[PDB]
């Protein structure tokens, strides 16, 4: 086929040195993109998590309203602003009637802080981990492509057809193989370096996000629904008891009023008898 032979002469026409150069340049571009979009971003995320954890620890012993205002003013970055809004929705404010007004006496947790400051939303999506965990494989595959294409160039040049020029063919083959393996080794080195950096960064991000959510979880106490159920059960029992005592007390008061009415009737009857005796 003319098409396939033209394709081969086009591919093999490139100078062999451009193959390791292309692999190294593109793999270095991938490494630079990894540094900019994953590594520095994760460093910023870790520093922000540490600073937020420090801020939360400073309001451990403050009033619940003051704590709430400080946390609302603290969280302003978009994803943590949304996470804080949802978390504050999860928090349950217990009100008591004090000095004629309803005041928040205690804020109760209903869900863990990690349910809204999740690893996904705060780490995995901003860092694009769904893509970057596959970058080392892409780099290794790029090295493999360089390896095939370099050995293709080397096998293409190997066609001596004469004992005198066998040495030149062997030299060219060794040079092309050397280029291919330089590219492959650089790609593998970059892939393992990226693996090191990304896994270390993701581990540190998860560790400090755990510290941040633990700091948030220590502000508010959970288990309020069970306390409400216990209050309801106790209320029902004391309600039956109070009902029976109110019935008995009503009966007693009714008896007292009826004996008082009988005494008043007796007084009226004796006064009537006295009046009749006076008249008679």
């Amino acid at each position: 086929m003319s098409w396939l032979n033209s394709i081969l002469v086009t591919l093999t026409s490139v100078e062999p040195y451009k193959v390791p150069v292309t692999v190294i340049v593109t793999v270095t571009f991938a490494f630079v993109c990894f540094i900019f979009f994953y590594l520095l971003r994760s460093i910023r995320i870790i520093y922000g998590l540490k600073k937020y954890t420090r801020s939360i620890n400073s309001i451990e012993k403050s009033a619940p309203e003051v704590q709430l205002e400080h946390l609302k003013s603290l969280f302003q970055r978009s994803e943590l602003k949304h996470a804080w809004n949802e978390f504050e929705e999860s928090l349950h404010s217990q009100y008591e009637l004090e000095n004629g007004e309803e005041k928040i006496v205690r804020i109760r947790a209903t869900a863990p802080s990690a349910s809204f400051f999740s690893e996904q939303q705060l780490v995995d999506i901003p860092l694009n981990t769904e893509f970057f965990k596959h970058l080392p494989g892409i780099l290794t595959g790029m090295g493999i492509i360089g390896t095939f294409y370099g050995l293709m160039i080397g096998l293409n040049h190997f066609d001596p057809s004469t004992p005198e020029q066998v040495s030149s063919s062997v030299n060219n083959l060794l040079r092309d193989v050397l280029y291919a393996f330089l590219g492959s080794a650089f790609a593998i080195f970059a892939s393992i370096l990226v693996t090191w950096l990304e896994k270390l960064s993701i581990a540190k991000s998860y560790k400090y996000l755990e510290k941040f959510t633990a700091a948030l979880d220590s502000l508010y106490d959970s288990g309020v629904g069970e306390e409400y159920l216990a209050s309801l059960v106790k209320s029902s029992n004391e309600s039956a008891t109070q009902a029976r005592h109110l019935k008995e007390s009503l009966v007693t008061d009714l008896r007292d009023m009826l004996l008082h009415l009988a005494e008043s009737q007796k007084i009226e009857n004796e006064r009537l008898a006295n009046t009749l005796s006076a008249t008679y």
Partner: protein, 246 residues
């Protein structure tokens, strides 16, 4: 029913890549390249040894042919009766080498040609081709298949001895012409061989003849002092053993 719908999710640690088939593939990539390189290098090397041996043998043959050609040209220039055959590395005598019954000495032309060919052989061995390839020269005797076998053998061997004497007899012109170094070199080169009975065409004139052939080092042959027997310098003249009344 008492749980919370806003619970933690994504509790899924990513599985690590299995690294050992990757190692297998990359180490076989390296091994495949190693085997390709050893293939081409070994093929090139073996072919180079084969062609080197072939061209070395051809160069040795060419040097032998050049030595024979120049020796034959010198023989023609000196005197014309010499017959040199490069195809079998043999110098023969056309007619002067004949012999009659109960005869053990060449004619005057035969003795003259025998004396003339010696310096040519010395020059041939002196040259670079001689140093590179030239072995000692043996002398072969030829006689008809008829008559007494022992008579023919003794006669031919006497012819060979007389030739050797004429080479090294003091009364011979060679001794008074050559020097001590040339005499020692002749002692190293000229040797006496056996007796052959190649009788053909029923021609007794050409059957009873003596000719000298030169041998050559092989390509694998080694030059060493053990084979290089050094004769002591001549301290006394040499008189031949077969006297004229014989």
């Amino acid at each position: 029913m008492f749980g919370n719908a806003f619970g933690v999710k994504k509790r899924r640690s990513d599985e690590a890549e299995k690294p050992f088939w990757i190692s297998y593939a990359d180490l076989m990539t390296a091994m495949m390249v190693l085997f390709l390189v050893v293939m081409v290098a070994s093929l090139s090397s073996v072919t180079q040894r084969i062609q080197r041996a072939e061209q070395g043998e051809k160069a040795r043959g060419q040097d032998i042919s050049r030595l024979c050609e120049r020796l034959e040209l010198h023989a023609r220039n000196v005197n014309k009766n010499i017959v040199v055959d490069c195809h079998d590395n043999r110098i023969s005598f056309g007619e002067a080498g004949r012999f009659a019954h109960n005869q053990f000495f060449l004619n005057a032309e035969g003795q003259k040609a025998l004396q003339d060919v010696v310096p040519l052989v010395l020059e041939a061995s002196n040259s670079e081709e001689g140093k590179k390839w030239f072995k000692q020269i043996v002398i072969e005797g030829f006689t008809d298949t008829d008559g007494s076998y022992l008579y023919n053998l003794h006669l031919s061997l006497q012819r060979s001895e007389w030739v050797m004497c004429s080479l090294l007899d003091s009364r011979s012109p060679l001794q008074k012409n050559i020097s001590a170094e040339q005499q020692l070199q002749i002692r190293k080169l000229f040797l006496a061989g056996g007796v052959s009975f190649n009788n053909a065409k029923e021609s007794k004139e050409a059957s009873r003849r003596v000719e000298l052939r030169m041998q050559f080092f092989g390509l694998k042959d080694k030059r060493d002092k053990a084979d290089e027997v050094d004769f002591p310098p001549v301290v006394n003249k040499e008189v031949c053993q077969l006297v004229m009344p014989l």
